[PDB]
């Protein structure tokens, strides 16, 4: 059966895509600085193999770090759609999560999840650099496990069908 | 607009779709093969046979 080959290759693919996890160079608000702080030496991102890429075509993670305004929501949707699959989305900050300090505003979208599917949320205002690091590492672990979460059932011979 | 005048007055006819039953036969390539083998025989094959004999 293909599973004999698929499962080890699945593990290798998950390991490779976890090791190389390039987010998009996109910051909107104060949460950008926290992202830069994680990128810089005190909490090196590179240790976990995450390197930022400017073009969405070369990005695996969409770091929605900052407030999203109605004047920008179409742009965020276009960026998400133009990012090559497979991809994940991480909301950072109260403003990106649920509107934050500007939830009662006439210009701010009440949450980036309304425009985009958000894979993970990192609470904070601003989230600490270690908080962002924790969120990214948790996202990486979940990403590695997503390939095979025990969906297929095992038959009498222990081979998934 | 006078530069593009030709395109404005161009009459374009909608396509009619039909099933092509002989597309994979490659009749043009078959004709090329027939011509090539005829020429090859008549010149090279005859010369080679006589010279070999």
């Amino acid at each position: 059966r293909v599973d004999y080959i698929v499962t080890p290759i699945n593990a290798v693919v998950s390991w490779a895509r976890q090791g190389s996890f390039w987010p998009l160079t996109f910051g909107l608000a104060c949460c950008a600085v926290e992202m830069m702080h994680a990128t810089v030496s005190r909490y090196d991102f590179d240790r976990f193999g995450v390197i930022f890429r400017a073009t969405p075509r070369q990005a695996d993670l969409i770091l929605v770090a900052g407030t999203l305004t109605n004047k920008m929501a179409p742009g965020l949707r276009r960026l998400y759609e133009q990012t090559l699959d497979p991809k994940w989305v991480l909301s950072m900050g109260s403003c990106a999560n649920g509107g934050g300090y500007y939830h009662y505003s006439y210009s701010v979208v009440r949450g980036c999840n309304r425009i985009i599917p958000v894979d993970i949320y990192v609470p904070g205002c601003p989230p600490t650099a270690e908080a962002l690091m924790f969120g990214v590492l948790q996202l990486q672990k979940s990403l590695y496990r997503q390939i095979n979460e025990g969906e297929k059932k095992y038959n009498k011979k222990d081979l998934t069908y | 607009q006078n530069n593009d005048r030709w395109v404005y007055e161009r009459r374009k006819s909608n396509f009619i779709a039909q099933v092509d039953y002989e597309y994979f036969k490659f009749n043009h390539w078959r004709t090329a093969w027939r011509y090539f083998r005829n020429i090859f025989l008549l010149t090279a094959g005859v010369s080679f046979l006589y010279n070999m004999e």
């Binding site: - | 027939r34 083998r37 005829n38 090859f40 025989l41 094959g45 080679f48 046979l49 070999m52």
Partner: protein, 54 residues
């Protein structure tokens, strides 16, 4: 006998086979063979003289 390919195609195949066989035969049996030109058919021995048939 019955043949899917035409008589002209049969003639072409025959003459092409004759060309191939005659070329190889003349290159393999009517040649000095002092130069290693056909691998696995000429010997690969180490020659101690200027002219040694391979």
């Amino acid at each position: 006998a019955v043949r899917f390919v035409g008589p002209l195609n049969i003639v072409f195949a025959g003459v092409a086979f004759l060309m191939f066989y005659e070329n190889n035969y003349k290159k393999l049996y009517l040649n000095p063979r002092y130069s290693y030109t056909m691998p696995y058919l000429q010997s690969a021995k180490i020659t101690k003289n200027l002219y040694e048939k391979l």
